[PDB]
Amino acid sequence: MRECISIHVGQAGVQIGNACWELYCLEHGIQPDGQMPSDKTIGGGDDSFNTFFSETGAGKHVPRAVFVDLEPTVIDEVRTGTYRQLFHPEQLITGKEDAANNYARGHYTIGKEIIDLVLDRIRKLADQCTGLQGFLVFHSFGGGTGSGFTSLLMERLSVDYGKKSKLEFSIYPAPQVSTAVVEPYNSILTTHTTLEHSDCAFMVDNEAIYDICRRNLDIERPTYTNLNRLISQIVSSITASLRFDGALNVDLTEFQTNLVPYPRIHFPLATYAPVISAEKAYHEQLSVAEITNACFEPANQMVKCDPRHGKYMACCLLYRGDVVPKDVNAAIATIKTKRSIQFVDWCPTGFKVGINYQPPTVVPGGDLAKVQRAVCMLSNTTAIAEAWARLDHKFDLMYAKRAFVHWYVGEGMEEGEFSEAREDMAALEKDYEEVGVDSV
Template sequence: LYCLEHGIQPDGQMPSDKTIGGGDDAFNTFFSETGSGKHVPRCVFVDLEPTVVDEVRTGTYRQLYHPEQLISGKEDAANNYARGHYTVGKEIVDLVLDRIRKLADNCTGLQGFLVFNAVGGGTGSGLGALLLERLSVDYGRKSKLSFTIYPSPQVSTAVVEPYNCVLSTHGLLEHTDVSFMVDNEALYDICRRNLDVERPTYTNLNRLVAQIISSLTASLRFDGALNVDVTEFQTNLVPYPRIHFVVSAFAPIISAEKAYHEQLSVAEITNSAFEPASQLCKVDPRHGKYMAVCLMYRGDVVPKDVNAAVATIKTKRTIQFVDWCPTGFKCGINYQPPTVVPGGDLAKVMRAVAMMSNTTAIAELYSRIDHKFDLMYAKRAFVHWYVGEGM
């Protein structure tokens, strides 16, 4: 998706970019340029077992990545946090940090890290937490944003999800600055309800998440009227250092067939961003209060419309703020309209909005997981797997 937004071909060449190695353009945030004019993403892929990373090694974009950026181990963490954090993860983490150091040395001004992980399995929770801890040690003050996939209420991939999740959340609490919560069930629902995809695959889900992450990071990569920085997110969304778990939503999510019949004005998409249906996380914001809200618009949007839309929302009694944070809105505007993946599910629209909100309703998510944790731990079910790996 990023490659499409910046006009980069699968082999890393950029036909529109005439200056080789010269330009200090905004897209250089995510791509570094080699001597031959090839653009390489600044990222590292890690997994403890080879199958998933091998798909990248053999896929369409295989020439885009440096082979050193794709790291895979030989045995996986088997859905076990202890394996990811203490036994198997330990062996691979130094290699990963070494690769990260090489990429970091290549940056002119390192702003921070974006970490993508899921906390249901063993690698995402265990190695994810371990990596965040080590990054805190090596790059102390740099901000770390994590996009974390949480276990959902109904859809489950492992029995021991509650254990891994609770153990890993400790690492997220201490070592990330902002965490964006996503859960698969909410994504499945969006695919079914808004995009008419009967049986969503992981590709459908990933493309949906990619759109949202793209909107959050658009301000780093393109120009706009009210541009927002990574550290600005933190400043505006996090009232207390430990309360940094953010729910994100995106609008308009509609399929190409429906797009012709909709009027997607700024007010319209702003309202639908506050609907529980467009959230990437199964919590009901009507059960909690908002502490802070960030709205990131992109495309054909002018500040006047935004102010009007926000004013309308403030008058609605349904959207409640905590009493110690009266205003609570931060808006960003970016002139680059959303790009869509050809053959994807989303319609090409002129304007879109991504909303990040810090709401007290996130507690629902944790109480759900804690309840499941307590039920299992009361019987000490499955605990021997963790103890056996040295916890």
Template sequence: QRECISIHIGQAGVQMGNACWELYCLEHGIRADGTIPGPKLAKPVEPESEQVDSSFETFFCETASGKHVPRAVFIDLEPTVIDEIRTGTYHGLFHPEQLISGKEDAANNYARGHYTIGKEIIDTVLSRIRKMADQCSGLQGFLVFHSFGGGTGSGFTSLLMERLSVEYSKKSKLEFSVYPAPRVSTAVVEPYNSILTTHTTLEHSDCSFMVDNEAIYDICNRNLDIERPTYTNLNR
């Protein structure tokens, strides 16, 4: 059994996560409430002859009641983006403990995400991740989704990566990150956040898949005919 735990941090990470889990559910035929519609077998099947597709177990964990819960944690220092999940179509898919939000955001400030507000929430996050890791029989590693420009995406991610390296030093950590671009920018300090988080996560990340905000912006413009893409479009 090989499992991966996904960690979605900040607005970008959480909104990318929404799109990802929607696709994972479609791919494995899992409904928005976590159940899989399937024919009920009349007679019990021998384990050897059982042709059950368990490929979903990499990303989902099955509960005793037959629900499939994503192996994912959503973290944001302010509640609005995560509240959209709590009230959205897929609210029945996630366990409330997986959605962790603080009361005030990092205000695009790396230091707030890493030192002040991040410090208050990091232990909660690590205990949730530990719980999730305990449910895995062969944890392969972590997929971390975040942006480099935001305060939470940069500051909190680097704090979490440092802590994960201490607790799970043998596990791989893959990053899926959104790099800021001057054309699509909401904060002047994005370059500073990026440099600070790049410096701290360089030694803790095994592999990083980067997308540039400007490139996604152009895709939205050219291929999807969205005139003025917002962050929600970009993250999807």
């Protein structure tokens, strides 16, 4: 009951998915072969971890997940990796020619050749569900598959599953770890076409994750492996409420009620702490007050922006580990006296708190230190519009000269889709300003 299906699209979506499911398995005691000794109900069950894992008669715990990429090299590493026995072969779907960082090829030319098979494989996952809650879609903004095929999939999922909830984990492009120049185009195109079909989207700025890995984990030149292990921890904090249960546990859907005041304003700002190396965590216990204070340090945000220059519409705190309300309330009271936390005048100012007692895990050989307690803040702030502004401005610079547009037109798109998508973004930026204005 309350199953969630994860869909990982393109390289970034697939590789981040690999990190998430590895971490999930460790948190739940699932082995690389899908066996879970602690699970005494074989072949089924209604436990909390069954929201993300199905069970076969042979005791294998199978992710409720589909991996999709338009070329095979990234998913092949799953087919032959350590957790290869975790997935049935039909959960891993590949073409042979990718979208070449072209939204048009991912949404049209190449994507239309595989979209039917993908939906068929998702249906088979849905049919195993007794009360499907929704989908979690992982993808980059910048890739041609992550952008173009994701939009196509989201549009098709609205048709096949009505308004069943669809959440995104979206990788916002950063030049430090990208070798593509047309990513601003793909980002605006996919954001425009997906905006109506997504109920809530957590953007992850690769530059923010890049900086956190360098500053807090002392990694000289972070790789995707480094970024993804950190991203998996935030994703885990966000989905922990669905996979574990407890008296103080608050369901993610209940947080969403507070985070989305209007359908289009559905982009929460995530902030995670503590990110600390083993060398610094040694003889170092970070308290509830210390990790909570870290949530309001902008350097720990998942998206580069300044919330001090915006207004809050919601503040949620998702704790996990050794945390009790008494200390949370004390920490919050302290922060309210020392921080620039301004709410819009039409929204209450209380912070919404959930606690999952299961402590966080770390993957062996990683750089993150294992801690007794962590926290993910989910805030709805107008400051996240700064991320749209930076991306829209790069879009405008290239589109004024029509740079690279021929690649998209050559695959069937029209200039009208570019201007139509950019106008939708301009209205979104406008929407974020309007919500921050004081009432009459």
